[PDB]
């Protein structure tokens, strides 16, 4: 995800599915290579203490001046027609200056972005359309015309460009927390399960204190926790032996 040779162009941002693995985030957060590391519903120090229902990495390249548009609730031509985060985003935005990887002395014109669109796109939607845009009130057809445009523009990345006009690689990690049966987890070791005694438990990052006992409740396969009228968890399915 972080060291692949060729990142996607931002109009066609690649999404990778992360699953069935141990995610040590402490190496990512401690590495001073990342210029941005902003988390929107968790602390970057707590990511190891936790599990995630599904995890995705969205990877793309942009200009340093547009990195502010990758935050949730934003506006501007990247947030409008290339890559929109949801206003309730949970995850971490990670970005680093890729001028040693994505800039060429004549310009690395391989990194496109969408320059026109009829209206702004939905959160985590991907616009791949190559149809000719109409700016004027006239209709337009075929390959070109007056007040008509190809909807994609290319970024001129050269290692001569001024500070903020160099390329930056972005990974947005997005996930849903503590609600459901997880398959990505931080590097924590499990203990044995202690029943009938008052204990500080932690199931998949759901920390608490209580007496655990054998339940006659049957959960369906898609359920990991049970709740009370007060929203407190009052039952759980053990993640190693599915009791």
């Amino acid at each position: 995800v972080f060291n692949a040779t060729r990142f996607a162009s931002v109009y066609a941002w690649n999404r990778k599915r992360i699953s069935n693995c141990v995610a040590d985030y402490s190496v990512l957060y401690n590495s001073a290579s990342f210029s941005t590391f902003k988390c929107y519903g968790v602390s970057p120090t707590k990511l190891n203490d936790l599990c995630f229902t599904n995890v995705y990495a969205d990877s793309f390249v942009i200009r340093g001046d547009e990195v502010r548009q990758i935050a949730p609730g934003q506006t501007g031509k990247i947030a409008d027609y290339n890559y929109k985060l949801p206003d309730d985003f949970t995850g971490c935005v990670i970005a680093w200056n890729s001028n040693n990887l994505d800039s060429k002395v004549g310009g690395n014109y391989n990194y496109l972005y969408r320059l026109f669109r009829k209206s702004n796109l939905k959160p985590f939607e991907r616009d791949i359309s190559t149809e000719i845009y109409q700016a004027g009130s006239t209709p337009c057809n075929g390959v070109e015309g007056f007040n008509c445009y190809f909807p994609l523009q290319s970024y001129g990345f050269q290692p001569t460009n001024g500070v903020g006009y160099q390329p930056y690689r972005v990974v947005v990690l997005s996930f849903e927390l503590l609600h459901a049966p997880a398959t990505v987890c931080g590097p924590k070791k499990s203990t044995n399960l202690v029943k009938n005694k008052c204990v500080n438990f932690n199931f998949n990052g759901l920390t608490g204190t209580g007496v655990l006992t054998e339940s006659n409740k049957k959960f369906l396969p898609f359920q990991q926790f049970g709740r009370d009228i007060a929203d407190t968890t009052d039952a759980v399915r053990d993640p190693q032996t599915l009791e």
Partner: antibody
Amino acid sequence: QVQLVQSGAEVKKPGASVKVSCKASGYTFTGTYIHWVRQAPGQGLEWMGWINPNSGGTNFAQIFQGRVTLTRDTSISTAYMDLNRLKSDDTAVYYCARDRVLYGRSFGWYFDVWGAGTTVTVSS
Amino acid sequence: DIQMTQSPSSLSASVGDRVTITCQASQDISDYLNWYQQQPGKAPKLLIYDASNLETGVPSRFSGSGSGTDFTFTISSLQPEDIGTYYCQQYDNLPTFGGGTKLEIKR
């Protein structure tokens, strides 16, 4: 265990055509370019072209442009090189080689994983 | 095109000798160069990339240096597995190889 497995030795008449194949395994076949490189008997390497296995887009060295055709079957992770109207000095070892998955520059080609090479012999 | 030339077409070197082989591009190539070794009867192997980045798992003796038109590859002390042809390759505009330098053991 990344690998590129090629067709066995090919033997051909002048003016004919040859279909070398390159079965990939151990990595996601769409992730990176596959280059085609050749080597005549007792001589240096010569890059022919590439295919991007995700988009099917191709680029060729000028000597081969209008001669070589590059294709791929993503359902069987196999890239192909077809070379038309063969001349005697097209007698060469033909390699497919992958374009480095990690740590490179975003423009750069490289040749990090190479296939075993397929000898083509073109003669009367 | 970018034409590339390697200065020794072959270079006899003893076990433990230092080997230096120089590759020159016709145009200015900045640092857009790779180096590959071909041992007799095998496909080439990438050793240095981006003119001086040493590849994963290759011996520490191999070095690459220089930028612009003129570049060097070096073996700090030669070992009898290093014997083969060494090729430079530009990547600024369609990946052209150099003519290759054969090493051989001096006797």
